[model samples]
Structure formats: structure tokens, C-alpha cells
Target: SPYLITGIPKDPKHPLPIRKDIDDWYLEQTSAGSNRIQLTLFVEALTVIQNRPLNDQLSYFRLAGIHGAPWTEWDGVPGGNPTGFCVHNNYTFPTWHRVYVTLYEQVIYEAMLDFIKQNVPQNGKADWENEAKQWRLPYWDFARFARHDNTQGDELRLPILVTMPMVKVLVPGQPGKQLSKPNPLYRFQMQTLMGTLERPYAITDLPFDKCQSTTKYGLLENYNADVWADGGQNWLRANLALNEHPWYQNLDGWDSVPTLQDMTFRLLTTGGLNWGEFSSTRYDAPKNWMNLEAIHNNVHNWVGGFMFSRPGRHDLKLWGAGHMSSVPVAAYDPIFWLHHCNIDRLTAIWQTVNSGSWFNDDKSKVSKDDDLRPFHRFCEKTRKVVFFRSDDVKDWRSLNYDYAITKDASRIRKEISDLYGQRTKEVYKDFGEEDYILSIRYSRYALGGKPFQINIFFGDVDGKDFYDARSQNFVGSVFNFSGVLSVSQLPARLAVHYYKKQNKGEVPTPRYVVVNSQGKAEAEVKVEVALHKTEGTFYDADYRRVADGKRAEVDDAYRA
Candidate 1:
């Protein structure tokens, strides 16, 4: 089964603590009912990817790049890194850190199966599981970064890449601590998979590695340390390495950290920039320049919660701190991906019931000096007001430079052709003031051979409060019609919920209705879907609704 952890067993090594039951936690989180809406949203992302050509899957990654979600700042605003795995109130980052990884593992398993079914040769299925097993280590390894790893005693040293002004240093593996490391090296794993509903059991006592580190100080003072670290590939060998080590996969891992090397070398190498001082301009934010495109440094995160947190889907916030929802840095961490995927899935589910985009147009003029709003279009807390404009960016070319578009343009075109070939094409009719739906049939893409409807809208809609029409302002929903397009067939939100059953090791068969046409009673098919929206239509502050009002509800309920 794709769900199996091939290399290791769930040994269940340590007995469950009153609150340390990760296994039970996994069970609770991955259950269909735990967050049914979130599951479907995940499935919708997978559906979008599946609809695209296999070769073009990378483009989806680019599309999902550069996102931010802050859970620590949600007051009524629509902000926070609500995408990847995250700790709610009371549960420190480590607890939710563990939570999201388990979810991601489950997503990986589900996506792997879908990948095999869609891409792998039938005969290669046997070996695919073993190969997939290898991904778990890297998967678990990356997730374990924020947790108390076996090597907690080691002194952490970073590469020159880590830098961020305004925010404090987040001690690696040390949940809550304030310290500075010269020349820090940081890395977050990249995802090539979309969504699969496989849940994960806790993995512990796995073999680890060892390495030495160094340091530097300020005021012409000399200070350093000789300690061992384990998270980076610097310690783990390639053969034993899980997924490509952070250092190996990308050199910018060293450049992104706010270590001594980052400040000194970066300033000297380029011009002059202070890399230290927790909030120094050099150490202000995470930027993967060496191994990434410039546009990635800014644009791309319309869906995945906090951009790099996980590899797939939008995210949500369950619990957090005061004024915590407004801090973008709190939500901008790499861990946001897993969290947002859940949120993204939930968003998809909400769209299933609601029916339009989740945002409205903001004719705001965002000059270079404009304050960075919580989200691209709407405020995180109130979820009504909106701000941000593409014109405010330094260079229009920069938008094109770092932004993600269809990577495998040729392959994508072919997939579109295939979809059209099968008679899924139709006239794109405007459904709302800023929305449209392709009035056609894509029955081949649904669970049953029933025609699926497609609607595209702008903005992020809250899935939890989605059903309440009062909350319908900025939140929009455009989704597929039922039949072949069952609400269950809806993308990420609804889709993930449906797939979660298999995570708990349940076997499911499509419930078929009779006499449709074929010799078979029921046709079982996994649906694939994708979504995108741009946010740069206006550039004037006066006309623009900067983070205020109930425009979200109005837009959510917007009709043509």
C-alpha cells in the first residue's frame, strides 16, 4: 500500500504521555470529521495538479511559492499563515510542528498513490512503494527541524544566508529562546507532490549524525563555539540522507540565515549590509537568493498559507496569541506549508458550498513606501478591508522575474488539449462582477462519469464560517456542480475529507448508481483540479479599500 512506511515500523517506542500521544493526535487530526472541509481543499489542489500534465506539476509549485500566514496575529482580520501545520493556543510551536508533519506525511502518501496511478507505469508499481519509503525519512527529517531532535545538546551554527530585520532569531530546534548565531545556514524542504490523504504515526529514535560548528562576535570582540549539530546534511551522508539535505539541495540555505557569515560576507561580497542584530535590514526576512528566483522572494502565495511552510494547499488557524494574527513574521516561517495545505483544502471545501471568490477589487495605490498589508487583498483580522497593488512593486519586470507561471507550457497546453479533446471545453461566461465559470463538462475527471462544472473567483474565503451568509462579504466561492461534480468531488476542501478515510486504513469503494450506460455498475475515478488569481488591477490609495470595512462579505455574496 502507498500508505506503508516501508523502511521502519511504528515501533510506538515510548509510552504515550497524558499529552504526548502523537499517534492519537495523528488519528484525531487526520480523521475525516476532524476537519472535513480542510480535507476537501487538499483534494482540490490535487485535482488542479492532476488536471495539468504530469510534466507541468512543477509550475504549480511556482504558483504556490512566496506565501505568508501569521497565526499569532489573528484578531478579526483575515491575516495569519493559515496554511501549513501550526501550533494553536497553549501548544507551543513544537506541538503543532509535530502535528503538521503527520498531516504532510498523510498528504504525501495520498499524493504518491495518485502520482503512481497517473504517472508511474503499471508494472513499476511494486518498486514504487519501496522508493516512496525513502521519501519518508527526508519528509520526517525536515518536519523534525523545529522539534526537539535527538541532537538538542549541540550548539547551533548557521550559514551567512539567515537574515531578518524587525524579527527575533528563532533558535533552531529550541522552541522559545533568543540567541544570535554568526553565519547561520537554514533550509526548508521543497515539495513535488500536491495532496494525498495519508496519515502518519510518530517516528522516533531514528539514526542520527554529528558535526562541528564555529562562531563570530561584534564590537571587534572574538567569540566562538565548538559544538555538534545534526539537522543539516553537513552531518548526514548522502546514502543515509533523507531527501536532499538542506545544504546540498540549495546553497542559499547558508545565505538566508542571519549568521555572522551572512552579514559579513554578504555586505563585503555585494556592497555593505549588517546581517546581525535580530532586526537588521540584512537579517530582516528569509530570502533564498542563491537557489531561488528573485520573484520568489516576494510574489506567488495566493493559496498555500505561509508560502514555504508546507509543499501544498492553503492553511488555517485554530488557536493563537493576542494581536498575534497581525505579525507576518510569525506566520512567514517555512513551516507554514503543511499548515496552509490544510487551510487551502478547507478553502476548497468552503467553495463547494458557497459559490464565488473570497475577495474583492482594491483600487489602492500602493507606493514603494506603503505598509505591507496582512494579506494580498484582505486584512487578516477583520477579513473585510483590502489593500496591496502590483504597481507599488519596484519593477514590473521583477513581478515577471520571480513570479510562478505555467512551467511546462507545452505540456500544459497538451493537457488542455486532452481535456478539450474529451469535450470538456465550453464558453467562459462571467458569473460574477469579477468571476467566471466554464460552462462545459469534464465528466472524465470526476469520481463517476458525470460532468463536472468549473467556477473561478478571486479572494480567500473562510471555510469554517463559510456557510454563514453574514460572513459572505469578501469571501468568494466558485466550485464544481454535483452529479459527476459531487460536492464531495469538490477540490481540496471536500476532496481531502473524502480521502482521509484511507489514512485510518479504511477501504472504500465508489458508491455507484445503476444503468448509467457501461457494463460496470459504478465508475471510480479520482478527480484533479487547480486554481489561480492575480492581485494588481488598481494603484490608487483613495479608491482602494485599505484594510477596512465589510467589503469581504459583500464580495463573498457578490452576484452578477
Candidate 2:
């Protein structure tokens, strides 16, 4: 398919294709006058095909995995081998979904072609059909909702369009007519026998788990759409409090909460290289609080809520079992695609962060070497399993879509500042330093059973500090070793140097005292810091290399 990949435009003036406009002639004009019209029709067409019989090759149940089959189980009734396979907590996590979404896009695009050909007026069918070819799936940039915008006169919240039960759109063929029907974008109804049954050790196979009865299958409708209470919010608040309070300060410890920007940086840092801990699949306890997967899981757990919880807790108050909450049922929900699209977008952004930071080329790993199991969809026309590997789907272009921006630190800054409140210049002035030297020394290499990562920072270490490196003193990060165990006592050391004059002269000198410190050391860790040193001498070759990497990482982020 020859097409251009575009972004989910967020500007208020920009039109998104959430609905269609009905004109005097009853022509179906796009609501926002953008590519969203095609997007709207394409999504609507997918839902139509999604409801077809399981044997229907284009049916949604067959394309996405079954609901409530204990994700582990892949056998049962009405089967030609269940499709809708998904991978989590493994190196294949990001790439597998990338291919999955691309398959969806292909199917949806084909659906749109059929829809336009049948619906549009004979004179206008060619144009609408041709225009539909350029449509790509839109990603829901959840981070964008985190910010507060004065122009909008409100803090961002979940887009209401997704929450509503129905959306109004121009009726196809019947120009000058409209209909308000069930919003296909809101949720996907499981019309067929959902997941395959034959449980090894789970509940009875009676629609294993059910969708939320009223609100969108898994959503807590009453909660504010934008900022629902997830455990991550508490984590955010804890970091902010530690940054400002004196009790939280330490020489080699107590940094602030990670700003949204820091989260993005962390995503890039962790996603580097093909076989590191960030992207690799080896771990005893992989979803440690701060890892990317942990953060990703947090979003899933938060959104899915009680519906996603384990089956044992089924009191009257317990109301989980939504598709979004569990792996087996997840893809059944329409939101699943939007959510994964953002993750896919993030993976692409990671690549843009570094020249070639996509995915690894390792063929030795079983998961990597083997064809991605279960994801292979039976193309009704071709009648063969379409095998995809990380290598096959590594490139975004191959899938025919891309994002608006790879990195949006400004959105993160505005969002955190709006939510947690920003630090004043006076606070920065009081916290700023003329010169500083922070050194971290660790011996976790000998004690480590699994690889450990330690992060150290200076001054008020919160989301605010992460907005810009110069705003807060960030010390170096150290990891004991990646993957295999080592008996070597090779002490790893990291030094961060700051000179007042070297900073923006016009800008106020950053308060960089060793006021509060934050440290996260796995296995065992320690920190040692000496006094200030001259700017030129402290910023040696190694410092330059480290600084260059950060600079290079951020240089092209917002360049376009």
C-alpha cells in the first residue's frame, strides 16, 4: 500500500474525523475538515466487519484475540487456531503489537474502500475512495491530556468523544441525512464465542469474563475522563513532595518525581540498543516500579480497574472483567488499538530519538528467532498464515504510518506544572549552586543476582527538575551489569559537574546545592561527593561525551 503516515492532529483549529458534517445537499463533509472523515468511516467499517461471523475472515473476534481465555490457553471451539495473539513483559512486546496494529490498519483500509465504493454517489465515489487511501489510524496521545492549557480555558481531560455511547455521522448514500448510533470507537462488542476454552486452572468457560454492563466495557464512567486516580498519581505526588522538603535531601539521594518529560527521556534511555534490559526479555522481576513496562502496565491496570482484577475478588463491589483489563480480553475493546497505537508511536519516537534505536537484530533469542506465534492471521484471500518477526516489522514505514512528534517535552512540562504546580525562580535561586561535584560509587556487581540500575540526582529532584537538565542538577546513572552475573569488583563511578558561568548567563544561576538527594539502588549502592571544581577542568573529555549524548538525544526531538 503506497501511502503517507501522518499524526493525530491535536490543534483545536485542526479538524479530527470524529464525526461527519451534513450539508444542504446531504454531502458527507468531515466534521473538522481533516483526514478524520476518512478515519471516521474507516473505523466504522472495521466495527461492522468486527461483528461478522467468526468464520468470516474479516471478523473482529478472529483478528484480535478472544476475551477471557486465560491468555495462556490457545485452543478450543469454533477454531482454526485462535488469532489476536499479544505479547507482554517480553522483548517482543513493542514490535509484536506494531505488526498487529498494521494488520488492523490494512483490514480497516480495505473495509473503507468497499464502504466508499458502495456508499458514495457515482460521480463522487472515485474522489472519496481515492481520498480514503491516504487515511491512517490516529493515536491517542494520552500524555497530551495531562497538560493544562489556558487557551482551552481548562486542564486537558479524556476526549469525551471516546466516552460517549453514540456519535452522529452523515449517512452514506443518503446525502442530507444523519444518524446517531452506537459509537464504534467507544467499544467493541463480543458478538461471537469470545476466547477459546479448555482452561488448565481457571474459572468455568461461560464467556470467561464479561464486559462492563453500562459504561464503556471497562471504563469508570463517573471518574473524570482526563485525570482518573491511578497509583501513578500517588507516585507523582510523592516525588514532588520529596523534591521541595528538606527531610528528603541527601548527597547522593532523594531526587524529585519524574516529570512527564523525564518519563519520555526514560523511555528513550531504556529502549536503547537491541539487547539491553530496557528492550531485552530476561528478568526475574522485570516490571520493577520505574521500568517502561511497569509504567505501561500502570496505564492498563488503571484504565481497566476492578474489571481487570483477578477473578477471586468477585464481591458485589468488585466490577472488573473488562477486555481492557486483561490480556485475553484486551484486544476485544476498540480502545485497545488506540492505546497500542500510542505505544507503537512511542517506539517509533524512540527510534527518532537515536538514529537507529528501533529494535535489536538478535536472531538467537527463541522468541525473536521464531515466527511470532498466534499473531499470524489467515488472509481469507491468500488462505495462508502471515508470519511476522521483530525484524520484519521493525520499520514504521513498512506499516504505512508515523506520529506527529517523536518527543513533546513541552507538553510534559506544562502538564506536570499544571497538575503538581511549578517551582518558582526564587525556589530555583535558593536551590541553585555556583559550582558542584557529585560522584557515585557502587559495588553491586558482586552482590547482583539480576541486573540492577541506580539513579542519583542533586537539588530539588522532582518533575520540575526534569523539565531541563540545567534547571536541576542531575548526577550520573549506573547499572551493575546487564543480563548475566559477574564476580568482578569493578567499581562503577559517575561524576556530574556544573559551573555557574557555563550556564545561560542571562538566566539566573541555578541553585545546585546538595540540599535534597534521591537514590534508587538495586542489590546494594553508595554515593561519594567532593567539593566544587573549575568549569573547564571539571568538564573533561568524558563529561563532554556524556553531555554530547544528552544533547544529541534531544537535538532533533522538536526540531521539526
Instruction: Report backbone clashes per prediction.
Output: 128, 29
What CA RMSD would you report for each candidate?
27.8, 13.6
Residue 303 C-alpha lDDT in model 1: 14
Model 1 worst lDDT window (10 residues)? 201-210
- The ten-residue window of minimal lDDT in model 2 covers 485-494
lDDT of 1 at 418: 33
Best by TM-score: 2
TM-scores of the candidates are 0.20, 0.54
**Cα lDDT of model 2 by residue, 148-258, tens digit:** 332321122333445556766666666566677777666565532222222331222113332322122223323343222111112222122212212122334423322
Q: Can you write out model 1's per-residue Cα lDDT over 423-483, one digit (the tens) per residue?
A: 1111111111121111111233243322211221123333322211122111111112111
At residue 275, candidate 1 shows an lDDT of 13
